[PDB]
Symmetry: C2
Subunit: 49 residues, 2 copies
């Protein structure tokens, strides 16, 4: 019978763990290099004669 | 009579001109590498027993 195989593992390496930095909604905002604000928006206008 | 002296000048060098980038309120905001938002604030709390 085909059974689920699990390879022998080694203790987790600290350098592998990145998950601690984006497991929460607020965190995903903190991870942004720049946050989108209304004053960054430039609206184009097509003025006719 | 002491009069205001003005030294002979050379044409303005383009590389000298930085003023075009912050002569307006909005521009001073655009010049910011990061804008301050409410979600960047962390308020400390002193919980007593």
């Amino acid at each position: 019978m085909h059974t689920a195989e699990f390879l022998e593992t080694e203790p987790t390496e600290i350098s592998s763990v990145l998950a601690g930095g984006y497991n929460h909604p607020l965190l995903r905002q903190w991870q942004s290099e720049r946050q989108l604000t209304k004053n960054m928006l430039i609206f184009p206008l097509f003025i006719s004669d």
